[PDB]
Amino acid sequence: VRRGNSQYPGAKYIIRDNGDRIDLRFHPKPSDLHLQTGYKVERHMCDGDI
Amino acid sequence: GAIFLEGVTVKGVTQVTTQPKLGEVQQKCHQFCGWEGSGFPGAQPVSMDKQNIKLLDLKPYKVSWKADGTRYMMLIDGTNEVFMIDRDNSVFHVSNLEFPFRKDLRMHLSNTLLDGEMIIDRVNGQAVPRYLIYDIIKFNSQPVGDCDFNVRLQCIEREIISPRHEKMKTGLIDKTQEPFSVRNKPFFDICTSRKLLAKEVSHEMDGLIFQPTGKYKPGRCDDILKWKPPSLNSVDFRLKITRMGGEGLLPQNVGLLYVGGYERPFAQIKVTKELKQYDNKIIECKFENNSWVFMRQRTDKSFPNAYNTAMAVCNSISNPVTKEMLFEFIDRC
Amino acid sequence: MFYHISLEHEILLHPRYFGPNLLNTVKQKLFTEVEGTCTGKYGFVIAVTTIDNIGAGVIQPGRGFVLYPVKYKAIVFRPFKGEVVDAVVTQVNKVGLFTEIGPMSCFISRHSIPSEMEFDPNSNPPCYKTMDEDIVIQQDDEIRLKIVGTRVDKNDIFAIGSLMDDYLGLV
Amino acid sequence: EEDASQLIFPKEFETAETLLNSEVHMLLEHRKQQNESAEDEQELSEVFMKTLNYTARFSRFKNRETIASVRSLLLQKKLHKFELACLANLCPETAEESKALIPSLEGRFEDEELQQILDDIQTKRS
RNA sequence: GUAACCGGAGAGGGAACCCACU
């Protein structure tokens, strides 16, 4: 997530338990970059993905 | 709300709701400050950190110490035309303050903007509201705000504090009849503040505020650094005590610490019934450990402070700047 | 009226609650979800005395959640159009009298109040009183009441009562 | 259509067992003792507290065996199940009062038997 | 430590025909 969308091995969205969707590619405020164990992160396709 | 000074009521100070004069006062305050946005046009300090403290050696500074008060701007534009402005941009009308002109004592100041505080000072066991003039913005259409900081301090002194004393010396102004005292906030060199922290006023001091000698700039001024004791820390949290139990999860109640302009819970607090009274109310919190905890509830404020404010305070509390921590840092110079 | 009924409910469990104690967490979830709850059809669910049966939980396809059909005995309170129960006063007001029944709160109106129960604003506590000054209805008094109509508000039941009926008054 | 006087009850709600204030109190106090022990449990609801203090102030007889005795003796006489608990909660002192409070009993049983049942109820009153 | 100064707004018709790709 800290790498983000610009760098390829990164994430595009981070989805929280409430369902709030944060977009990583447009200036994410450093507060919501932090993540807990319940959240989902939409990483890019990587090696070994099926 | 509209409360001039919390704790003590001051006679003659009257909040004004009348839109025609409110608009003129606010707009011409913006005009005097050359302030881009809306709201409070005055210069706003920032909390000191490891990066801020460097700025002290890059350029000379003047020092004063923060005392408990509310941010408050006097606009002097006539005999009774004194409209009185706080950080919330609210305007109050004060009656009996008269500002003599130094050349003609019968002439009163106009188009003058001062920077100061309402501080309650208990002397002889009685609360005496006082105004400390630490900066001047505008003076009789002259751009004194573009002058040097020491120059503006001397304008404050000679043009305001002295003519009034001249007129109480002759009795044409009565110190007893004015609603509250008017003074200038004392300023010293960076060397003097070291004695402040054999410090016998260590408990009587709320912190330090450092003023650069440069020209006045409105809004957020990055090189004006306030020093706040870390153990004494501290933001206005808008709280929604919420029973957040996710789908498939045991229902749980938590306190969500919201801030200004950020739609999501900035942080969480250990919600408790002894904290349930102030449901949906603006509060201050202390970040001693990884948990923000409640000291006092601010009924006066209605909005949580900004996200950048939250960031600045988080950085400041993460690097606790203590009196011994900067004492040596200036003693080396 | 208070009852003892068996009810059916299905609770979803997050996979993190599976643990070594899943049934205890199921019991806790059912308690926290149906304790103090209100339904317009069945009335107030005061407490669950026991859980009759906990069925086989089905794993939702595409979702980690598991739902258990649960049988449990619970005590319910749902009032009637036509039942009579004793009630306790909470507030005296000129529009009417506020009285408290179990969990639910109902009010008696002045026109439903018999005309003998005159108002006494000037009594230090506001009172409902006769001209003969015999019956004194006041704060915290326990009274008989006849509940005629019920309303559902945010899935919570409030009702209204009548007091014209005979013998129906102060205990 | 749902009327207590004419004895229309929902079909889903027909077979439920009706309860007394005193036995509701003993059940709720059992639950309170269960929750105060075995800590790390949710705090009881305001509804629970209101029902508990209501049935405490409205408890007719505290004895547990008295509950079973009055239940058994009144059910031995052929009466509808809903009427047992309402009669025992109201505790009328005269059969005229009992018939006024519950119109269903009006004409169901004679005055002498109804008053004898009521007198037994006040006899077991604590 | 101000009345966040706008809140990142992206959703951008459709039908028809023609050519072309595997």
From Swiss-Prot, chain A:
Cellular compartments annotated: Nucleus; Cytoplasm; Chromosome
What processing steps or modifications follow its translation? The tandem heptapeptide repeats in the C-terminal domain (CTD) can be highly phosphorylated. The phosphorylation activates Pol II. Phosphorylation occurs mainly at residues 'Ser-2' and 'Ser-5' of the heptapeptide repeat and is mediated, at least, by CDK7 and CDK9. POLR2A associated with DNA is specifically phosphorylated at 'Ser-5' of the CTD by CDK7, promoting transcription initiation by triggering dissociation from DNA. Phosphorylated at 'Ser-2', Ser-5' and 'Ser-7' of the CTD by CDK9 (P-TEFb complex), promoting transcription elongation. Among tandem heptapeptide repeats of the C-terminal domain (CTD) some do not match the Y-S-P-T-S-P-S consensus, the seventh serine residue 'Ser-7' being replaced by a lysine. 'Lys-7' in these non-consensus heptapeptide repeats can be alternatively acetylated, methylated and dimethylated. EP300 is one of the enzyme able to acetylate 'Lys-7'. Acetylation at 'Lys-7' of non-consensus heptapeptide repeats is associated with 'Ser-2' phosphorylation and active transcription. Regulates initiation or early elongation steps of transcription specially for inducible genes.
Q: Which domain of life is it from?
A: Eukaryota
What function is annotated for this protein? Catalytic core component of RNA polymerase II (Pol II), a DNA-dependent RNA polymerase which synthesizes mRNA precursors and many functional non-coding RNAs using the four ribonucleoside triphosphates as substrates. Pol II-mediated transcription cycle proceeds through transcription initiation, transcription elongation and transcription termination stages.
Subunit comment for this entry? Answer: Component of the RNA polymerase II (Pol II) core complex consisting of 12 subunits: a ten-subunit catalytic core composed of POLR2A/RPB1, POLR2B/RPB2, POLR2C/RPB3, POLR2I/RPB9, POLR2J/RPB11, POLR2E/RPABC1, POLR2F/RPABC2, POLR2H/RPABC3, POLR2K/RPABC4 and POLR2L/RPABC5 and a mobile stalk composed of two subunits POLR2D/RPB4 and POLR2G/RPB7, protruding from the core and functioning primarily in transcription initiation. Part of Pol II(G) complex, in which Pol II core associates with an additional subunit POLR2M; unlike conventional Pol II, Pol II(G) functions as a transcriptional repressor.
Q: Which family does it belong to?
A: Belongs to the RNA polymerase beta' chain family.
- Note on domains (UniProt): The C-terminal domain (CTD) serves as a platform for assembly of factors that regulate transcription initiation, elongation, termination and mRNA processing.
State the name under which the record lists this protein.
Answer: DNA-directed RNA polymerase II subunit RPB1
Instruction: Tell me the name of the encoding gene.
Output: POLR2A
First-to-last residue of the parent protein present: 406 to 455 of 1970
UniProtKB/Swiss-Prot annotation, chain B:
Organs and tissues of expression: Isoform 1 and isoform 4 (at a lesser extent) are expressed in cerebrum, cerebellum, thyroid, lung, heart, liver, kidney, spleen, large intestine, testis, skin and muscle.
List the active-site residues: K66
Q: Name the consequence of E117A.
A: Loss of GTase activity
Q: Which residues bind GTP?
A: R71, R87, D115, G116, E117, K226, W227, K228, R296, Q297, R298, T299, D300, K301
**Which keywords has UniProt assigned to this entry?**
GTP-binding, Host-virus interaction, Hydrolase, mRNA capping, mRNA processing, Multifunctional enzyme, Nucleotide-binding, Nucleotidyltransferase, Nucleus, Protein phosphatase, Transferase
Molecular function terms from GO: ATP binding; GTP binding; inorganic triphosphate phosphatase activity; mRNA 5'-triphosphate monophosphatase activity; mRNA guanylyltransferase activity; phosphoprotein phosphatase activity; polynucleotide 5'-phosphatase activity; RNA guanylyltransferase activity
Q: Which GO terms describe its cellular component?
A: nucleoplasm; nucleus
Q: Where is this region: GTase?
A: 1-333
The protein's annotated catalytic reaction(s) are: a 5'-end triphospho-ribonucleoside in mRNA + H2O = a 5'-end diphospho-ribonucleoside in mRNA + phosphate + H(+); a 5'-end diphospho-ribonucleoside in mRNA + GTP + H(+) = a 5'-end (5'-triphosphoguanosine)-ribonucleoside in mRNA + diphosphate
Which GO terms fall under biological process for this protein? Answer: 7-methylguanosine mRNA capping; RNA processing
Q: Which compartment or compartments is the protein found in? A: Nucleus
| Source taxon at top rank | Eukaryota
Please state the Enzyme Commission number of this protein: 3.6.1.74, 2.7.7.50
Provide the residue span(s) of the region labelled Interaction with POLR2A.
102-158
The entry's function note states: Bifunctional mRNA-capping enzyme exhibiting RNA 5'-triphosphate monophosphatase activity in the N-terminal part and mRNA guanylyltransferase activity in the C-terminal part. Catalyzes the first two steps of cap formation: by removing the gamma-phosphate from the 5'-triphosphate end of nascent mRNA to yield a diphosphate end, and by transferring the GMP moiety of GTP to the 5'-diphosphate terminus of RNA via a covalent enzyme-GMP reaction intermediate.
UniProt subunit comment: Interacts with POLR2A (via C-terminus); this enhances guanylyltransferase activity. Binds (via GTase domain) to the elongating phosphorylated form of RNA polymerase II; can form direct interactions with the phosphorylated POLR2A C-terminal domain and indirect interactions via bound RNA. Interacts with SUPT5H and RNMT. Interacts with HIV-1 Tat. (Microbial infection) Interacts with HIV-1 Tat.
**Additional notes on this entry:** Isoform 2 to isoform 4 lack mRNA 5'-guanylyltransferase activity due to disruptions of the GTase domain.
Its family?
Answer: In the N-terminal section; belongs to the non-receptor class of the protein-tyrosine phosphatase family.
Q: What is this protein called?
A: mRNA-capping enzyme
Its taxonomic placement starts with: Eukaryota, Metazoa, Chordata, Craniata, Vertebrata
Q: Which residues of the full protein are shown?
A: 229 to 565 of 597
